[PDB]
Structure formats: C-alpha cells, structure tokens
RNA sequence: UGGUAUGUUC
RNA sequence: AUACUUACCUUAAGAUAUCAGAGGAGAGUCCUACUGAUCAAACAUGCGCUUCCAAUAGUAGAAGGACGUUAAGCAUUUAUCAUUGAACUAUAAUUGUUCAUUGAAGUCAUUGAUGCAAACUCCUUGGUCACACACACAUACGGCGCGGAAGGCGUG
RNA sequence: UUGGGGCCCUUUGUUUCUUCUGCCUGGAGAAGUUUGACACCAAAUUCAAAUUGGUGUUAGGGGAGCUGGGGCCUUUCAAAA
RNA sequence: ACUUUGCUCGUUCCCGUUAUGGGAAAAAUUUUGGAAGGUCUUGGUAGGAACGGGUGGAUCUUAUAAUUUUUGAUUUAU
C-alpha cells in the first residue's frame, strides 16, 4: 500500500530536516506535517537558491515531485520499520 | 464511459477493439503487411525498420533497423544498422508508414 | 499485452542498452522487474562521441580504469531509451505470448 | 573493486550493502540502503553525495579528479531523479552472522508475542 | 479512488425545466441534512435525491439577481421542521433518561434513609445533617456528572474545562445542527 | 488499514484525520519518547570493542619488556564497581542535560530583556512558542499548578524599574566546583565576609 | 458488525 | 483497571510458477497425495575451480578518509545600476574617467573561489594463523595445510 | 594434586550469560537459566520505597546418544554386453 | 528371425581326448539401480505435520500509457 519510505517521512514530523529541490535550492527547517504524497510543509525555513544566495521563509510548502531528497535526523537510524521479522499482535476481525 | 466501472477482466477485449479500430490502425498494418516504417524519436534518431509487436505503451520490436542522426557542429549524418531493437514508447515522437 | 514479459523470457542474454543520457551498456541480463527495472552483470559502459553530465555519470561510477567496467548495475525504467538484443536469438519463439494465448483461449 | 557482487540478487537481497547510486545529474550518493518500495525510494545511512565541478570536467574529458563530497548522514532519496544503482562496498558483518542475528530477532519476536499473550490473559 | 485522475473524472461527471424531483431541494437551497450527517455516528444513510453543483450554481445565479423559488424553500422548511422535531424528541428522551437516572429506586431509598436521620443545638445538628445529605447527594450526582446539551441534545460536564468543551463544539454534528437551527430560526422569522 | 509500530495498535481504513489524531495523543507520545530514549541509550551503551590481533612479538622486545618492571593491577568488588558505574552514569546524564544559564540571569534587568531573553516575544521562534501551547484539555492539568505565570510582555520599557539596586536583586551564584576535588579548596579566605 | 484518541468516578 | 460521554473513521478487486498428455464433473470452465519437462525458494553437499585475508629474523605497511596541519602554500580571476551637477570620450537607459545628493533589492565570503603540487599526523578493517628461513620452472611454476569472507558451476 | 617455562589479561564493570562475594603476592568461589529471570529509561503518587509503559540480554568451546547429507571399501538381489 | 544337421574358432569346467568334438555354466569379469555393515568429514538437537481464516506481510494483473516518481521536456542546439 503506502510503503516503508513514506512511513519514515511521516515518522519524522516536528524535526529539523533538510530538503533539496530539483532546481538546486536546498531548504532546511522543521517539518510541520508530512503526507503520503510527500507534499511536505516546513517551518523556520532557511533557503539556498541555485544562484547561491541564502534567504529565510517562515512557512513553506513544497510539492513531492520537485524534491531531490530530504535528510532525517540520525536517531531514526534505529526504527521498528527497519525490523524484518517483527510479528503482528492479533489484527482485528 | 469511466475506466474503473466498465467490467472486470474484459478490458483486454476493449483494448483489442481499440487496437483494431482506433489510432492503432497503422501499427497493425505494419506488422501484418511487413512494410517498413520511419519512426522519428526525441533525440533525432530516425529509424527505418519493420514492426514486430505492439504494446499499450507503444513498446515496439523492430527488425532490420537502419537508424540515422545528424551531428550539427559541421553538418554530418551518421547512420547505423542494428539487427534487433526494442524501442520504448517514451522516445517516440512520430511514426510514418510508407505505401 | 505488456512486452516486459517478453524481456522476462530473456534471462542470461548478452545485450546492449542505450540510455536516454546517451550511454551504451554492454552486459548480460539477470532479471527485470515488471516496471522494467533491469539488473545486469559483467558490464562495460561507454559514452560515445560532448555531454558533460553523461561524462560525470560515466566517471563517478567506480571502476573507470572511456570504457568503464562494472560488475553489477541496476537500471531504472525511465532511463532506458532502447535495448539491442543479440541477432542470434530467435524472436519467433520468445514472443509466443502465452499469456495472450491463454487470454485468447479464455474468450 | 574486487567485491564480486552477487550474480542473481535483487533489492531484497542487496539490503544493507554500501551502494553507490547514480542520478540524472550525476550526483552520486554513497551509503547503505535500509529500505525500498515500488517507486525505488531508498533510505541511505551514513550517506555522502559526491559531484565533479565544471572546471574538473575539462580534465575529465579525454590522472586525478578532485570530487566535491558533502555529508548527508541518514537521508531518504526519491526514485524519480535517480538513474542507476551499483554495489560499492560490502557491509561489516557476514552472511552467517546476519543469519544468526536474524534467528535471534525471530526468537526475540516470538518471545515478545508470548509476552503479549501472557499480558492479554 | 486509488488514482486521483479517476477522482477528477468523477468530479467532472458529477459537475457537468429546473423544477424536477431528481434535484434535491434541500441541497438546491443549501445545507442538506443528509449531507451534514454523511459519515458520522448519527448518519441517515444516503440521500435518495441527487446532488449537483451546476444546478446549485444556477440557483445561486438566479437568487443573486433573477428571482427566488418559494416551493423549494417551503420543502426545506418542512424537512428542517421534521428533523428538528425528531431531534427534539431525542432530546426529550435524553432528558427523561437523565430524570430516571436521577430518580432511581436505590438512590431514592438511600436519600430517604438519609433524610429520615436528618431530623440552637438542634438547629446546628439539623444543619450538619442537611450538609451531610447535600454531600451524599453531590457524591451520588458525581457518579455520572453528565449534563444535557441545550442545543444539540448531547451530554456535557460541568467540572470539565473549556478546552475539551471547545473540542466538543467543533464537530460535524454540532456545526450541522447549529446551521440547521439558524436556518429554521431564519425561516420562522421570515414566515412569522 | 494502518498499524502503529510504536503503540502496537491497529486502526480502520487509513484516514488522515485519524492518523493525525493518533500522533497527538499522550499514550503514543509516552511510548514513542520511551522507545527513542531506550534506543539512544542502547546505541550509546553498546561497547563495540575491536577484535584483538595478537602477533608473535619480537625477541628483544621480550627481553626489554620483561625486565623493566611489573605494574600493579587495581580491581574492586561487585557492589563497589556497580555503585561507581551508577554514579558515573548519573553524572554523564546530568552533564548531558545541563547547560550554562548565566547570561539569562545576568542580564535580567536589561532594557531589552523582554525582547530577546523572554523566549515568547522572540521574533523568529516566538510564533512556534505561541502556536503549540499544549492547550491542557484536562481540567486537572490547569487546576494543579496554583503559582503565578510571571509572563513578561514585550511592551515593558525602561521607565519601569529605574534603579536596579533598590528593587531587591539576587546575589549571583558562586562558581561551582567538583565534589570529588573539594578537599583542596583554600580554607582561609582573603577578606572577611559576613553572613 | 468495529477501531483510534481524549475527559470524569471507583 | 472497571463504568459513561465526546471527536474522526468504518474497508480497489482477482490470484499465488509455466508447458504437454490421461481421467473425472453439465465448444468453454474446474480438480487430480495423476504423470513427464522447465523455472523459483529453502537445506545439505562436492568441484587439484575464481578473488582476498597486514613485519614482528621489525619499530613497518595495504585499502578508505580526515567534514586534519604546513596552508593567508604557489599561479590567476571578480566584489552593483540609474538621474543630475563641474570637464568629458561620445551610435544606449552620458555607457568611459574624478567627486558627490537621491532612488529598488542589496549572500556572508577576498585569511574568499578555481587549478596545481609535496610532506607530516591521526582515525575504521583484517588469520596480524600451523611448519620452515628452505633452490623451483616451457605442458612457466608440485593451487596435495587448518580455516574465514565474496562468488561461479554441478548433485541430492 | 603440586611445581617450572612460553603467551594473553583491552576482559579497559580484570571475562561480557546473569546475580552475589572477591582479585594482580592473581587468572577464583556459590546460585539460577525461555510461559521464567536479570539490568536500565520514563513518569504522577511530595525522601527512600512501591505501581505502570518499554528497551536490551539469556552466551562461547569440547564430549556421549539420535538424525540428515557427502566420499571410500565389503556382502547380497535385478538388468545390459 | 525361428528350426535341424555336421565343420571350424573359442571364456571357464567336466567327458570322449589333450588333434579335436560332446555336454554344462550358458559362466570369471565391467557398468547401473536397490538392501545391509565398517571407516573419514559436516550440520542440527526442541519443535514439527494437517485444517480453519469477514489472518498479517511479500509477488503478478487491471484500474495506472495524462499534474505525484515507473511510459519522459536534463546530450543546451534556434
């Protein structure tokens, strides 16, 4: 259905992440609320245009197809989404 | 008619009916009469070849490919003969059939 | 009637692949996804006569020492422009389309 | 690089390998994969992104090449703007040690299910 | 749907005289009660009449400058009056259930046993016994401590703070029912 | 369907309004915070030691090393090393949690204390403080604390508190010293200090 | 035929 | 932990490898602890197979780096436009030269950026293993030790 | 059981399976081990203490018995030259 | 191909006889498959088999060749 990477992107909500866009502009800020379509909203945004300059947005909202990548913090190195043999405690009928 | 509400497992019959009586009349005519067609691609790679198979994505199998492109610096034409080819429908600009 | 199932019958076939960037990849096929994510081994790839982005993509894959010899490359579907099959393979027996034959028999 | 990547392996078998994944730009990401999906969205542990400058490209055109490396750490890369992925370096622990670790994870998961069944009673 | 293109095709197919029974008059005027209770626990099921956006835009363009239709307004008034009567019957049933819970058999027996022992110094003893009976009544009422919502007929609480109450007022049921009460009061002010 | 890997709780068909409300509730917060704390504690506490490589040492190194001296090994009992390592763990966590807060209490009477140090009238991150108040929908969380808020507004000017010494300040804290090396303090002061 | 979250009393 | 109120929601389907033949069920479909063949997975197992596994008869060195130093190393290149005033080269929205009033944004960086090149130091990895400090080879090298890591092929 | 010689003790919590005692004039002793036990984190109950939710560990080597498979030799049956 | 009559060569044994025939085994020996024993080496030693699912996770097909990856505006050219 959804998959592991979109669940990991929805996992790190409310944390300082860093995006890079397809044009080359790198954003960095606190993730407000991520979605399954990766259309992600950031706050306290610092932006670097592909020309080179640095600016600051207050509340950005980027579409998921114009994202090169996004960096989650390192404590999500150890996540239960990464566990291969985690069993399921009795799903409901 | 909406695509999701037609039927189940009978969409292949409608796809074959669109293949016989739709825009696919030229790819069908080339594979049954073995006539050579000229496919112009998105990077000036013009292909003169015969069609072997049809796909929904216009993925086409071509036999006895004579392809030609033009390098513009100065102006030279470079060609290549390739025996078998599997062309993706992403690269295809246009398909011309000769009578 | 997807012809990716035609490429699924092409295991251990020694082919070339021209990509949309312009790189020619000579290697044997191992497997291919139904989304045409094809894996190849015993690979040498070459950017012919330019595109500096393609030269960067050619060199920055490890194993350059402009023919680059690599052991294992997975290739995404949308980067595949065309794939050239060996002429010794018979296309009349590999394109039998047994799924299409079962669909015609089910009609 | 004498690694001898497996001859009949796929993305479920290439997990926790130090990949060297190529993109459309050529911005090569080096790091361990830990997950994927249908769109080939790859998470990358201890990842580094390497490029070549425009001035180095003239020397690269037909020796030493000074690549520009930036450190990303644990990132999550999309499958749209990527081109190809290879296996660069083998992981630390071996196949038998990963097998013993997977058996320990299975036994720990079965013990956790027995603990949930004991707490449910 | 799993693809958004089929959702957009559905929006186009449902977006593209006028006095016909197929057009929902409560939706043609606005705020149909079968629309304001679609997926909640107080759902009526499905509206038998069809809803359309082009007919709603034509009705808005007609009510902007052209004219107004009193028959659809009277039908919406009758539907709002019937739904308000059903909700008032539900609120009266909830008030009767609260009065039956406040007048249970064992609770009234304990209250009568406390009041039978409730009877200067005698006045101070009677005041202390009345305070003890009031404390026992407060302990009996605090076992549930459920009030009655004056508008929507739900249950509330007095010791609950204003933030959980504000979370209660921002629901689909309460917004829809306050809008229906505003429409009913506007139609009763226009008719009378 | 949706399954929380943290809380080990299932769900109905995947609604964004339900999944958003699941990551706000207090049980998911407790389980998630405890899981992150325990995984960080495990990856700190895991002493991944190097695999030892012992070679056949040289002859003259053996005649030099076995004749210089023989050192003495110190070692302790089980309860002693357990108590010492527990004190070292609480010292490491209290050093990881602490921070120097001298500039906040040292510029307390400054005329721009209500514009930078108040941390609510701050310009760049003050909207983040004013956004999530944790609005305390429980009445007990609002009725528990009965002390003053002392919220310093931005509009406080220099006219208020003109003389900082008449309005009673606090004497500054002394420089704290290590308790394990507290026996080497100069016991005699330079000047006579009263009270 | 149900699930998630929250607030009171024992 | 029990009891109750409230807020949101209440589900895209079909299937689990392929081919040929025989039998059964009222041209088409299903089943066979039915038979032959291909393929996949798991467990074992062997191929004088393919690659690698760091001195100790010393104070070293192989692979990958430093987001380390010398190093502000050496050689180059840039660091805003317009109106007007006192002269002005002048096809421009006076571009060029010296000085200034004013007008819109106005990356920090010039100890900056690119290229070139050497030395030093420090990090992660290993069989830092068992015998010996030894005279072999045109069919070029007795690959006929105990293993480990990666892979190929073959068998059950 | 004692004594001598060589190496290692980074095992850095001085063996790291756990607990307790204990150690460099030594390298040890006692108990337990998967519906259990051990260690730790977080909290409101106003010291300590107790309760609840989770995390991680329960190991390595050798030997008797049983079983699966690989290679060699021997005995017997069926088939083809 | 069956069948008979005698000659010649011949694996082994017997007999008329060591020329040569008669009879028997129609054999000693090589390979394959199956049954048993001995020796060398390796793995495992507490879970396994059957059935049931308004079971969970993976794989294929169609929605889905149209703005969210995967059926293209990244070889910088008029």
With touching defined as 3 or more inter-chain CB pairs under 8 Å, the answer for chains E and C is: no
Q: CA F96 to CA F115: how far, in whole Å?
A: 29
The 3-class secondary structure across D14-64, one letter per residue, is CCCCEEEEECCCCCEEEEEECCCCCCCCEEEEEEEEEECCCCHHHHHCCCC
Q: Which domains does chain B carry? A: 1-99 (2.30.30.100)
**F88 CB inside 7 Å of strand I:** no
What is the resolution in angstroms? 5.9
In this complex, which of C31, C37, C57 lies closest to D22 when CB atoms are compared? C57
Q: Between the CA atoms of A66, A67, A68 and A74, what dihedral angle is there, to the nearest 10 degrees?
A: 180
**3-state DSSP call for residue A30?**
strand
Beta bridge partners of E23: E50
3-state DSSP of C60-99: CCCCCCCCEEEEEEEECCCCEEEEECCCCCCHHHHCCCHH
F19 CA to G5 C1' in angstroms comes to: 10
CB contact under 8 A, F137 and E159: no
3-state secondary structure A23-58: CCCEEEEEEEECCCCCCEEEEEEEEECCCCCEEEEE
Distance in angstroms: CA E152, C1' I79: 95
Burial tier of C72 (Cβ tally within 10 Å: 0-12, 13-18, 19+): buried
Q: Map residue D90 onto helix, strand or coil.
A: coil
Question: How many CA atoms does the CB half-sphere of D26 hold within 13 Å?
Answer: 21
Q: Indicate the fold that domain C1-97 takes in CATH.
A: SH3 type barrels. (2.30.30)
Residues forming beta bridges with residue B84, ordered by sequence position: B63
What's the token pair of residue D15?
């997990």
Inter-chain residue contact A75 with F124, CB threshold 8 Å: no
Residue in chain D lying closest to A85 (CA): D106
What is the number of other CB atoms lying within 10 angstroms of the CB of residue E132?
A: 13
Bridge partners (DSSP) of residue B85 are B62
Task: Provide the strand spans (E) within chain B.
Answer: 36-41, 46-53, 60-72, 75-87, 92-97
Q: Which residue of A has its CA nearest to D81?
A: A68
Task: Give F 27-46 residues with CB within 8 A of chain A.
Answer: 35-36, 39-40, 42-43
Residue B80 backbone dihedrals phi, psi, to 5 degrees:
-155, 140
Q: For residue E32, count other CB atoms closer than 10 A to its CB.
A: 21
Query: Using H for helix, E for strand and C for coil, what is the string for F127-187?
Result: HHHHHCCCCCCCHHHHHHCCCCCCCCCCCCCCCCCCCCCCCCCCCCCCCCCCHHHHHHCCC
Assigned domain for A62 exists: yes
- State the structure-solving technique: cryo-EM
What Å distances lie between residue E97 and A26, E145, E160, CA to CA? 62, 14, 21
Contact E171, E36 (CB under 8 A): no
CATH number (domain holding residue A60): 2.30.30.100
Does the distance separating the beta carbons of D38 and A4 come in below 8 Å?
no
Chain F neighbours among E 155-174 (CB < 8 Å)?
159-161, 163-164, 167
> Where do runs of H (alpha helix) occur along E46-158?
53-61, 70-102, 105-116, 121-141
- Give C87 to chain D, closest Cα distance, Å: 24
Cβ atoms within 10 Å, residue B31 = 17
- Three-class SS state of E95: helix
Strand-pair category, C24-32 with B75-87: unpaired
Q: How many domains does chain A have?
A: 1
C63 touching D (Cβ < 8 Å): yes
For strand B75-87 and strand C80-84, is the pairing parallel, antiparallel, or unpaired? antiparallel
Pick the CATH number of D11-87 from 3.30.450.40, 2.30.30.100, 3.40.50.620, 3.20.20.70: 2.30.30.100
Q: How far apart are CA D49 and CA D47, in angstroms?
A: 7
Point out the residue nearest to J53 (C-alpha to C1'): A93
Specify if A87 maps to a domain.
no
Q: B38: which strand partners?
A: B48, B96
Q: Do chains B and D touch (3 or more CB pairs under 8 A)?
A: no
CA-based nearest residue to B96, from B58, B52, B48, B56: B48
Q: Is A91 inside any structural domain?
A: no
Partners of residue A56 on adjacent β-strands: A46
CB pairs A-D closer than 8 Å: 69
Please answer yes or no on whether F6 and A80 come within 8 Å at the CB atom: yes
Q: Does residue A72 lie in a domain region?
A: yes
In a domain, A30, yes or no: yes
Place of tokens 């058996």: D103
CB C68 within 8 A of CB C58: yes
Residue range of the domain that includes A50: 3-81
Helical packing angle, B25-32 and B11-20, nearest 10°: 80
Question: Is any atom of nucleic acid chain J found less than 7 Å from the CB of residue C48?
Answer: no
């Amino acid at each position: 259905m959804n998959g592991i990477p979109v669940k990991l992107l929805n996992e790190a909500q409310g944390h300082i992440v860093s995006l890079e866009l397809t044009t080359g502009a790198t954003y960095r800020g606190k993730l407000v609320e991520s979605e399954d379509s990766m259309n992600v909203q950031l706050r306290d945004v610092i932006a670097t245009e592909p020309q080179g300059a640095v600016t600051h947005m207050d509340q950005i909202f980027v579409r998921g197809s114009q994202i090169k990548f996004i960096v989650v913090p390192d404590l999500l190195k150890n996540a239960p989404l990464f566990k291969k043999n985690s069993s399921r405690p009795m799903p409901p009928i | 008619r909406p695509k999701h509400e037609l039927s189940r497992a009978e969409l292949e019959e409608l796809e074959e009916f669109e293949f016989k009586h739709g825009p696919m009349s030229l790819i069908n005519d080339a594979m049954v009469t073995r006539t050579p067609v000229i496919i112009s691609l998105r990077n000036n790679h013009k292909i003169i070849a015969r069609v072997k198979a049809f796909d929904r994505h216009c993925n086409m199998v071509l036999e006895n490919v004579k392809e030609l492109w033009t390098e513009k610096k100065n102006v030279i034409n470079r060609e290549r003969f390739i025996s078998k080819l599997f062309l993706r429908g992403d690269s295809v600009i246009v398909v011309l059939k000769t009578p | 009637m997807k012809l990716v199932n035609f490429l699924k019958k092409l295991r251990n076939e020694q082919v070339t692949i021209e990509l949309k960037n312009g790189t020619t990849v000579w290697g044997t096929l191992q497997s291919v996804s139904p989304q045409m994510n094809a894996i190849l081994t015993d690979v040498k790839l070459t950017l012919p006569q330019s595109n500096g982005i393609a030269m960067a993509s050619l060199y920055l894959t490890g194993g350059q020492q402009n023919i680059a010899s690599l052991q294992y490359i997975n290739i995404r579907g949308n980067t595949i422009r065309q794939i050239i099959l060996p002429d010794s393979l018979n296309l009349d027996s590999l394109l039998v389309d047994q799924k299409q034959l079962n669909s015609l028999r089910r009609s | 690089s004498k690694i001898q990547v497996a001859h009949s392996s796929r993305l479920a078998n290439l997990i926790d390998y130090k990949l060297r994944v190529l993109t459309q730009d050529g911005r090569v990401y080096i790091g361990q994969l830990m997950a994927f999906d249908k769109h080939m969205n790859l998470v990358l542990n201890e990842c580094i992104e390497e490029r070549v400058p425009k001035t180095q490209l003239d020397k690269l055109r037909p020796l030493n090449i000074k690549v520009e490396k930036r450190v990303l750490g644990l990132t999550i890369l999309r499958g749209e703007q990527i081109l190809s992925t290879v296996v660069e370096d083998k992981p630390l622990l071996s196949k038998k040690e990963r097998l013993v670790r997977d058996k320990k994870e299975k036994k720990q998961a079965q013990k956790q299910t027995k603990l949930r069944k004991e707490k449910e009673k | 749907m799993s693809t958004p293109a089929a959702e957009q095709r559905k929006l186009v197919e449902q977006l593209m005289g006028l006095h016909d029974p197929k057009i929902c008059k409560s939706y043609l005027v606005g705020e149909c009660p079968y629309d304001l209770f679609q997926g909640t626990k107080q759902s009526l099921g499905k509206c038998p009449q069809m809803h359309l956006t082009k007919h709603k835009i034509q009705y808005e363009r007609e009510v902007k400058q052209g004219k107004t239709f009193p028959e659809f307004e009277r039908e919406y008034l009758a539907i709002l009056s019937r739904f308000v009567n059903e909700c008032n019957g539900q609120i009266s049933v909830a008030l009767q259930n609260l009065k039956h819970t406040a007048e249970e058999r064992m609770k009234i027996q304990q209250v009568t046993e406390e009041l039978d022992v409730l009877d200067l110094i005698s006045k101070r003893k009677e005041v202390a016994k009345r305070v003890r009976n009031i404390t026992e009544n407060v302990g009996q009422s605090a076992q549930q401590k459920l009030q009655v919502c004056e508008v929507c007929g739900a249950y509330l609480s007095r010791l609950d703070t204003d933030r959980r109450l504000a979370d209660h007022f921002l629901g689909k049921i309460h917004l829809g029912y306050v809008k229906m009460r505003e429409d009913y009061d506007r139609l009763m002010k226009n008719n009378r | 369907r949706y399954y929380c890997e943290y809380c080990h709780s299932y769900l109905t068909h995947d609604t964004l309004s339900v999944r958003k409300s699941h990551l706000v509730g207090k049980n998911h917060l407790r389980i998630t915070a405890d899981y992150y704390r325990n995984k960080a504690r495990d990856i700190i506490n895991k002493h991944n030691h190097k695999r030892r490589h012992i070679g056949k040492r040289g002859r003259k190194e053996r005649e030099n090393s076995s004749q210089n001296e023989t050192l003495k090994v110190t070692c302790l009992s089980n309860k002693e090393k357990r108590h010492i390592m527990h004190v070292k763990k609480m010292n490491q966590k209290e050093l990881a949690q602490t921070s120097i807060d001298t500039l906040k209490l040292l510029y307390d009477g400054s005329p721009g204390y209500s514009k930078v140090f108040v941390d609510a009238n701050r310009f760049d991150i003050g909207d983040l403080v004013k956004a999530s108040k944790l609005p305390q929908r429980a009445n007990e969380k609002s009725a528990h604390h009965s002390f003053k808020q002392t919220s310093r507004s931005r509009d406080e000017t220099c006219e208020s508190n003109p003389f900082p010494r008449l309005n009673n300040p606090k004497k500054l804290e002394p420089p704290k010293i290590l308790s394990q090396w507290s026996n080497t303090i100069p016991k005699t002061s330079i000047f006579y200090s009263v009270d």
